[PDB]
């Protein structure tokens, strides 16, 4: 260091010690028990952020001069289309070019050696309903609805210790979102108030914000009226500015105008029985002191993504200009209630008659450990859908990669020349991900992948590595599975980020003098 | 040189230093005899305030890179449920990180040990009904009501000689604020001067302002006027400069246009009764005459802090323009005085028809460590309205935490295994308070440890340590009680808080010159 | 400003690192499943060397700036008493310096903390005795002689595949040096020439030197001469006074622990005498007591005032070089073992091997008293101290709990040797002693706990009282002090 | 440019340096909390020695550069005439030197400081009679005999637990010793073993030696033979002692005729013993029969506890005696070598001295609150002196409580308060932790100890003064 | 600083500190009489002590 241009061998040393760099960090985020880290930085952080999935930090920063943040860029289309589970890709690509060492011994053409990972493609045809598979996930499902794929994304998560608890409510909430819907209507917040259960499971969608200390408390047999346009009326062509006016002469006439706006609100509200408005956008004043006597409960400036999702739930709503009352709009009856949460004033809306959206809140104290909840939570949301859709998953704790472990060495013996040496580099990858998860479950390492290896060798794709049992076990009793999407997705991209790292040699500037 | 770059061990070394360098300012509040620190920092910060209360000072600021600021937020919400006494939360969750050096030697899972924190959660119910606490409370009370907790929290402190008679003073405050609803409203004020009650208790809501020398002494079934806008006029959007004219006549016009603002602040005022009137800001001189003769007391440049507090306690009113008067006010009326306090004289509003809100006034020897009785009535004030509202307390002077400590010592061999290590670690946790409570006392902190475990091994709950005694007696003499809330909640907390830190590890830092 | 700035709480750090880079080192060298180590150097030394004894590698050298070379010394005396077996003894008092951290905390007098070396007085005494070593060793004995502790000494050293015979030999030269008579005159040596056995018992005294080439090649009846003064020295009458006495005797061998003249030399080879040139004084000692002694004088000497014993007396060719045997001694009370090996440095590891066997067994047949191994001993005794800690008054109960979990480690060090998972097997571990059988302990082998006696693994009674005392008075000395080593005081 | 200047203000801190850093090594050393310290030097010096009294260790060799050796070499004087105590007259001298920061500020004249010296020698004379203190000391005494002085000595030693007992026993060895009787033929050593009391006072000399394995175990009606030149049954002989190497043939007779024989006996035993058993006349082997006297009550081999000692006891002539004392073993132990010469040194002055004041800090006390007036007397020059002198005996109570594993501030306060009322009995309890009554406890200090402890101290104190440069060079 | 402890429980020395005036205000000095105007107890005293 402290002099640098890049020629041959010493410009593949950069991309080496990058890709072990990020594995460590990494690689304690696997498995039921992972880990957590904390990043400080200055001007647009406020804080340090503590970022169990690995993803999210990745991008966010850029900390120093060796090269694997365009490495790191692809993830995000991954996770996208599915994305999480557990970090296991960058990993795996990683362990890649330890071996890379025996390449240069290897000495003939790296391109030549290039043609394994295509082979990888056979091992990727092999693996290929090979692995018995989970008959499971036949739609909603009592038992298997969770403590399976989310409770093992959540497992590396640092709240865990209340959090696995979290994610078996989450699939409760998938079960509403299944057929009639999208992917929407799905909102969720964090609250102040230490518990043992850290949520509850909403009936409605949960919202925050009041007309003004004045209107009933409660509502009932309630109508609920949505509004594209805001209630203000009077800036157009000659505002002006806020107005006084000389004696009462000329004013007289622009109040008038005025008038004619609150009336209208209010007789076509006192028919339909009116219990709440809501409005995304600013609210005009006039209307407000009304609703107050009228005994309406009203939302000034409430959120559109949150509106549109209470739609659904409601019954909908023809949103227009004030012809918009009566038979355009449609709405659900229930409770809608404004109630204090600890601390942080709060209203609920419930008891909605679709029954196809639901919201779920979370309480904790308003650190930021809180608002790792906020986003841990969308990481369970996410698992889930795709369990239901795919109707295929695999053996969790590391037995998948046991059994592909075993055929793949029986793969470079067997077909002779180039190929051999490049397939069983390949193989060898596998092995750690076995030894990891041994690991960081406070049991010896080496007697753990010993024991291992012999019971996916017998034939029970079942068995599998239990880190509380220290031994090896049935990963099936315990429920946890892997989702089919997650291992076909890795396998695919692991090759070509490889691709490009090697494909090239010599990058061309940027000195330290 | 270097990029202070920071690797695995010396990782753990920067969270392990933000917990001990907290630790030492914090740990001379707890106990008798604290030291008192005041901090001005500049920027946005606009007084030197002085806190021995360790909750209140670690929020207000995030004052570095190394990670701790996550921690210290948490402790609120514990205050918000009872989270006061002494500050010995974060004390002990810091001591929890000297043990990581071990965890080291500890070769095997540093997250199965966190284990050990859910395993807190055991402890924390093992506090719970483990060792009659004791029971009363009755209501308003002869000599329950004090001579208790509030004495021991303030047994912290040096003041303890005169100041435990100020304690006993401030459950006077719970019992004529009983049965309304919850803890609100309790402002406390010192006073320059010295007298052997150091305190005196007043009926109402206390103020320092006077309007001038002249205006009658005090006003009774007094109506108050509070008003957003000064009473002072000139400036506008007309200009004449800073003059005066060429003769007089022209004079008069200017003259006759200041009267009409005096003639409707009469006209007006007369009607309502007025008898107060109170602005937060500067007030024109030309009411003040008026005001006089009227026999109305009004108060210049008002502190906005005050009047808040004072709205919740006359009923609120709206502040606006000079239509402010009759009915767009809310006055409530019984006696509003000034009344000489010992030395300098004081503004006292009482008999507040709502009652929600309450004052208590206390004297002291005029210093700006006179502000440490302010510091004591917060310590007071917030466990006495939760001993109502608990309606359970423990034994206090360390009486609790030995014996708790005897059941823990047990339980780690015990139990076979990887958390038996955990468990015990947690349990010599406890020792360390019986040791903080006799060093500040000024006794020989290593016999008091040794001594103080005989009596309570032997199986007596009343038995605890003496501060004054310089050994251990009977804490039901001494009538020092903790609330039961502060217990369930300060073991959840320290564990929470404490969880998040050991699994963070990795610190950022920037240069050394 | 000349260098090194430290100060008093800066002091104990310095003695606090150089006791944590030899517990590393030292902690796989340990038991059965211990391992050898490598060091290279320059200057008087020329390439790398291996030592599987702890004692010696550590006397060698004085690397660094940290001081620990005082420490180390101490060790070398220790292998006098007893000193080996396995070297745990470094361990164990190193581990004791970690709680120096909470005397920071102790905030006071780090000498009345010192106390806690008494409350190791009566703690190393608590399940010393409260619990039984073994139920017991008769003396003499048939089969429990040996195949035991010479065994587990014996099983860290390479040497073990014909050596373990050669452990089992030592005892029965113990059996004979029973009595009040204690540590004297035994004598080892290496021999050339071999057999399977690899070991020869000899009843008598074996010395290495010959005349000279002329003399009789045998005698028998032999008489023994021991001089103080040499025959160093009118000439022709020191030959005559010593002819004239020597024949009426019958003399048959003559022992000097000096230079010899050579005038003599030439009539005793006619005269039918053997006499000896530069006899080492060590080896002479030992031969008054078995030949009933002499008095040792001036020419003088002969007749009554010397005392000859006369079963045998001869030099034979052994295997291949030629020596001295002294044999058939009266007394009984003192006797010679010579070694026939195969021929190598393990040959060499003979000399080593048994100089360690005589004194482990000497005090075997004495103390009646052997402990289980395997750490058996050691995980006992914690779960009794752990009690201990509440129970005791003051200024004891804090430091009282600090020696007790120092047990711990012990049973971790034999465990993490051997590839096994440390948390686990000290959980097992400690349920099983707690029971209350003395006999179960680790095994290696298994991967968990087994029967301990079976196997044959005992230690000393002794090792464990000594090792106790001396590991605390070394780290108390350590502590006391905080620069040290400079000039002529005040 | 800076070799090394230092005239009058620099030349005092020198001579102030000295004197601080002798103190901190030997401060620890005082009191029951006192400490070992470990030496190592080269050049006829083998290896690391320690020594747990200052004035053993300081006198061997002088270090450097700063003046220090002369103030040393007076303490061997002291303790020839007396003794050792506790090593405490350096401390008290040292001391002395840190009121000079006071004087400074004083600014008057340095040199008539000095004069306040002579007042010193008034102020031990005073520190006598204005204050009560003695009280005792009649002949044998009763219970004052000891759990005295001895005991203050022995209350710096770890031993005290039970090894006061062994101080309280010293006395009565004295009391034998005591008359126009020389102070000859004492011999101690030590023993390991059970029992309560922890040591036992015999009725004759104690030996440690062996004629060899082959000799009869137990003689009785025994005869006693002494002969000054190197190598019976008419005489009924059961023991033979020679003070030198013995021949060998001779040996062999012993054994069966049931006598044993003392091989290389030292002779300084020897000559003991003689007083002892009545004497012999040592000559050539015509020395059996009359012109040797021999004492017959019993001499035989006793395991005392574990090891076997020869004990000679029943002696007729009750001259002379010997005391066998009892430890723990341990360098510690030889600590009691240390102390028994000390303790021996003590009594012989409490006999002919007839005075002495009482123990465990109350003399220091009392002295103390009339030390403050007593410098008020004097012309305000002279006073200053003998006030800072007075200010000094402060530390002293401080020191013996502070060692004492109580806290040394609550117990300065409880301790004048008791002083200041008037009685002398009252003083500090070591064994209590707070003041208690120093008569009922029976401690009472020699009244030698007292007033050449403070000569000691004041010589000290003085070399630094008075002498501008004790230095050298020679470069130019 | 050598006290080594709570400098706070020192501070009962102020305490202390009251009684010692007390001992000034009731044990030395004073004076008889000051009867107003007065012949000869006009001065010749305070004064000239601050002069």
């Avoid at 120093?64 to 993830?75: E, G, I, T, W």
């Avoid at 006016?245 to 004013?251: H, I, R």
Wanted: hydrophobic share 40%.
């Amino acid at each position: 260091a402290g002099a640098d241009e890049e020629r041959a061998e010493t410009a593949r040393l950069s991309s080496f010690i990058g890709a072990i760099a990020i594995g460590d960090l990494v690689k304690s985020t696997l498995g039921p028990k992972g880990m957590d880290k904390i990043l400080l930085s200055s001007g647009r952080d406020a804080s340090l952020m503590v970022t169990n999935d690995g993803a999210t930090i990745l991008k966010n920063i850029g900390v120093d001069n060796p090269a694997a943040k365009v490495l790191v860029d692809m993830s995000r289309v991954q996770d996208d289309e599915v994305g999480d589970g557990t970090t296991s890709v960058t990993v795996l690509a990683a362990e890649l070019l330890r071996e890379a060492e025996s390449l240069i011994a290897k000495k003939i053409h790296p391109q030549t050696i290039i043609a394994g990972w295509r082979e990888a493609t056979k091992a990727a045809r092999q693996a290929l309903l090979n692995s018995a598979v989970d008959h499971g996930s036949d739609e909603v499902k009592f038992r298997q609805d969770l403590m399976n794929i989310a409770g093992t994304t959540l497992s590396s998560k640092l709240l865990t210790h209340h959090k696995d608890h979290f994610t078996k409510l989450a699939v409760e909430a998938v079960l509403r979102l299944k057929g009639s819907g999208n992917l929407e209507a799905i909102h969720v917040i964090k609250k102040l108030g230490g518990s043992l259960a850290d949520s509850y499971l909403d009936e409605g969608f949960l919202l925050d914000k009041k007309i003004g200390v004045n209107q009933p408390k409660r509502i009932e047999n309630a109508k609920i009226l949505i509004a594209n346009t805001g209630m203000d009326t009077d800036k157009i062509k000659i505002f002006g500015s806020r107005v006084r006016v000389d004696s009462t002469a000329k004013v007289a006439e622009i109040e008038h105008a005025e008038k004619e706006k609150m009336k209208e609100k209010v007789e076509r509200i006192l028919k339909h029985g009116i219990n709440c408005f809501i409005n995304r956008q600013l609210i005009y004043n006039y209307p407000e002191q009304l609703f107050g006597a009228a005994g309406v409960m009203a939302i000034e400036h409430a959120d559109f993504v949150g509106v549109e999702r209470l739609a659904l739930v409601t019954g909908g709503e023809i949103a227009s200009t004030f012809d918009h009352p009566e038979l355009v709009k449609l709405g659900s009856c229930k409770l809608i209630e404004e109630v204090m949460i600890g601390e942080d004033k709060l209203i609920h809306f419930s008891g909605v008659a679709l029954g196809e959206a639901c919201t779920i809140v979370l309480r904790g104290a308003t650190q930021q450990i809180l608002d790792e909840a906020e986003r841990s939570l969308h990481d369970a949301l996410c698992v889930l859908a795709q369990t239901v859709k795919d109707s295929r998953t695999v053996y969790g704790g590391g037995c998948s990669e046991m059994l592909m472990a075993h055929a793949v060495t029986q793969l470079a013996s067997r077909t002779p020349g180039k190929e051999a040496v490049a397939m069983e580099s390949y193989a060898k990858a596998l092995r750690m991900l076995p030894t990891i998860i041994a690991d960081n479950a406070g049991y010896d390492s080496a007697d753990l992948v010993a024991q291992l290896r012999a019971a996916h060798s017998e034939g029970k794709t079942t068995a599998g590595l239990d880190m509380k049992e220290g031994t090896i076990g049935d990963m099936s009793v315990l429920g946890i599975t892997e989702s089919f999407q997650v291992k076909r997705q890795v396998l695919l991209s692991a090759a070509e980020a490889a691709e490009v790292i090697l494909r090239v040699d010599n990058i061309i500037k940027a000195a330290p003098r």
